[PDB]
Amino acid sequence: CEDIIQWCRRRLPILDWAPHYNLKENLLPDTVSGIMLAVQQVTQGLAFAVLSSVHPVFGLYGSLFPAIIYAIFGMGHHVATGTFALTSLISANAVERIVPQNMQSVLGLSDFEMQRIHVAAAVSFLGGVIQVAMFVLQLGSATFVVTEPVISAMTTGAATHVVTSQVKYLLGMKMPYISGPLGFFYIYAYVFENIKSVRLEALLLSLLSIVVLVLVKELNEQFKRKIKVVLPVDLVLIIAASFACYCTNMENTYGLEVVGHIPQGIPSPRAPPMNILSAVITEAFGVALVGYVASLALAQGSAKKFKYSIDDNQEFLAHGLSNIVSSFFFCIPSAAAMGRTAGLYSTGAKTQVACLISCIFVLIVIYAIGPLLYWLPMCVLASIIVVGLKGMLIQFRDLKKYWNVDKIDWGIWVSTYVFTICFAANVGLLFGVVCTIAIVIGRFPRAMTVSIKNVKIISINNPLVFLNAKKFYTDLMNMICYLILDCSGFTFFDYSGVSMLVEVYMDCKGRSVDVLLAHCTASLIKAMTYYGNLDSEKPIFFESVSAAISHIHS
Amino acid sequence: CEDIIQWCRRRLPILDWAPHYNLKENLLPDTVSGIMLAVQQVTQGLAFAVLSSVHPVFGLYGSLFPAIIYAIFGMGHHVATGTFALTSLISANAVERIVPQNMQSVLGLSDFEMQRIHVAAAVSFLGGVIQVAMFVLQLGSATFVVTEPVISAMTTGAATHVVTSQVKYLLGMKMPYISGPLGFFYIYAYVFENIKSVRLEALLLSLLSIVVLVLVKELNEQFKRKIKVVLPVDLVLIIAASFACYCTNMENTYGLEVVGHIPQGIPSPRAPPMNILSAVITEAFGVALVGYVASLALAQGSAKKFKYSIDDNQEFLAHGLSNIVSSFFFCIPSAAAMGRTAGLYSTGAKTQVACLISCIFVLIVIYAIGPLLYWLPMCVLASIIVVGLKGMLIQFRDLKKYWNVDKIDWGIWVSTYVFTICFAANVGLLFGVVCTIAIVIGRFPRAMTVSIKNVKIISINNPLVFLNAKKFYTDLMNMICYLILDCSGFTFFDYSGVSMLVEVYMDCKGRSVDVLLAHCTASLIKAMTYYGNLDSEKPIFFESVSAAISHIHS
């Protein structure tokens, strides 16, 4: 009765912070964070919808719709759901495979543009369905398999992949869709083979914009104590570039790529094309895994920093519901990006309200100044993206820590980074997880099982399992008229451990060495008595080492 | 210098027991075991060459050739390499897929029989190459992953599969090659659909032979103390059945299947058809894995019973070399069977000489009485096989032990048996291994990490890793002006453990609780000092609990 109501209330985390909303504190920083996040989301959506080989207008919908669903069903406070180019790079494979370039209407867009957004929407819907399906299980309670070095290496490799996917806009050249197990080097080979087609105007503009952005963003952070605000350099740069492009004929005099139409939209929702759900299984799995792990890392970091507890299983439901609901409005797969979380940290956001004022501003942009973004050069947008990827790219400094701490996760980090830079992000994540599991499995047979205490007393550590049964037998045999075994920490065992213990007892009896147990539990006592046919009228199992010592003096 | 010679001598284990061969003791039981094993090998080879959809004459070569190679390069004493129907069931898939029945000379055999033995030889060669390849690595030092319940369940399921593959001979009907993910039930469905074609004569003969064999083999074992020998009932039954078939016209008067030609052979060796090595990858992997695990189980059992030590990596080289060498003589994949090991145990064999007298007798059979086995009915051979599978089929009694000991390997046994009876032996083995690894991984976060000793002292058990870092933090936080941590067993850690320890120390300092370490090693001390920026001029790390207690009194 009441338990069901409590469960239902626990599945709606918006009821825990909405009635407790402070108006004196969390209204001005929330609004400022909302405006900054709105600008960030607009830019990132426009830049990452193109990265997925999809018309840029759908990036606004992908940055607007899932945010509300996450706000309703999400537990993280400083998590802003958006486009997350990592998933765009995965969806682009399916989009370009199902509908390639050779075959070149609800919003006035020409055909061959619907056939790509339909594939993207199907991918997002399947990813959301998968996320909800592993939410209804207890998946999420087992998320310790993914480790900090693995996520760091995968994110750094994906950031490098995104950086190398924007050079075709900074230089101004045109490239075909190159992807595969070694596309990172093929892209540079193509760039260097056609080095005579690089436009100087686009390169100079990109260099100037990058220098200005880096200088402003560094000087603002260095002297944050004197100016207690965040300078909106991106908006000023965008406005200046657009006005310079419009006031001149820079579209025609110099060959430059600009954002095409961005029509006023939000059309009627339509169901995804369920008939192609069988051709996008791998993309859906990759999206549903990488987006979830990347968002969960940020949510856990926020929870640790701001001293609150989250649930690793509610994020599954939140992300799955957001993807499923947003798939009906022609949206690409969605997740949480590190840049928006860093911006929220810097501005000083407090609650999830800042993710709704940004939605309001995105709606205003969609319905009011949609056609006003025609004169924005693509070089400026690419420079903004590569500057914003600084937080992801700076993670190379963790190598010193991993080298000075363990020297084993250093190798895992290097291997995961290499595999991510070669094949892809999802392959790198899978390789890192498998390598971590194999390494932790292979270390058990090479560790000492028993310890010697100052008639000898020998203490067992704990997990006497099939991983370290033969090693335990070897360690105990290499250590020999009496012998006491302290099984205090020993609580975790299986058939192999019991068999090895009984064999040890039998062999020690053969060598005329008596073995007495000290702190055996009830289940272990029952199992050892059954397996070895031990009589209950002979003192073997005791309750403490002192009791065994007292029994010795007889 | 000398180390290389020692390594080379260690790769030839025949030099350790040949010069030390006793002639007074190990000559009569070795000869008796040799004769019995020769009869066993002849029967099993003739019955398992047909099971692989291959002419029965090659079973003799498969039982003769690899035995010598194993004797030279093998470590087990009571291990007799042979045909091992488990591998025949796997090779039959490739044989029937590459060369199906619809297309129906070195030894006078007709065509379409060379195209099948070539595929079988290629499969065996690839399996041997794979086994040697994982021998040149250090694979074999990691064989603890496979557990006793998994091997028992896989062997029982394979024995049931072999039993259900011999009903078409006991009944006398004819069946097409049925195989797949559910062939076990399809075979019985076909049998029951054509129940009107069952021959009564073959059924009666099979029933009489089964009853006689079971009664003799039970009465010989029950009263072994009065008669100190092993009754050769199989040879007497074979001779009687052959003479009854020849003296009558049982081939013509009643429809009966008999062994066809068995020509005098051992032709010139020929290389396998390397051009089809790409179509038999899965079969080769399955054979090389299941044969090795099944032979290693028997070798380890013999070593444990007879008190000698073997190497888990030399068996790889022995089996790989045996398969590679025997592939050039038109042989099916080879491994070790449990029935021959049980026969060697019962007879009283002592060394590997008993595996060479059997080879001599098999050679004599091949070159002398090859054509004399024409009049042996197939029902008698199938009955002999199903009677000999008793040792494998009796393993159902381990369920009581697994239920009374752990109740978790009981579920693993049941699941592995079900998956083996449904799909196949190799799929069942893979499922069992994966399930065991996943179960042992998932148990770590649910076990208590720290223990309380009788200013409180708390002892850490040992593997502070990513599996149980959050659980360790929760356990330590649920247990709170002073606190001592005994890291005596603690020797196995990584980055996650160090991070959790430092976070625990920081949080306890925040709660005004002092944490003092007791038995930290050098590497752990260095890592914890680097990670937490701990000053070396403050007493934190000690050498014993008594030292910490003495430091307290100040």
Swiss-Prot record, chains A, B:
SUPFAM superfamilies attached to this UniProt entry: SpoIIaa-like (SSF52091)
Subcellular location: Basolateral cell membrane; Recycling endosome membrane; Apical cell membrane; Lateral cell membrane
Cytoplasmic topological segments: 1-55, 138, 196-199, 248-278, 337-355, 442-554
Listed GO MF terms: bicarbonate transmembrane transporter activity; chloride channel activity; chloride transmembrane transporter activity; chloride:bicarbonate antiporter activity; oxalate transmembrane transporter activity; sulfate transmembrane transporter activity
Gene Ontology cellular component annotations, sorted alphabetically: apical plasma membrane; basolateral plasma membrane; cytoplasm; endosome; lateral plasma membrane; plasma membrane; recycling endosome membrane
Inducing factors: Up-regulated by hyperosmolarity and down-regulated by acidic pH.
Protein's job: Acts as an anion channel mediating the transport of chloride, sulfate and oxalate ions. Mediates the transport of bromide, iodide, nitrate, gluconate, thiocyanate and bicarbonate ions. Its permeability towards bicarbonate is weak and increases when pH is above 7. Mediates thiocyanate transport in retinal pigment epithelium cells. Mediates iodide transport in the thyroid gland, playing an important role in the synthesis of thyroid hormones and the maintenance of thyroid function.
Protein name: Anion exchange transporter
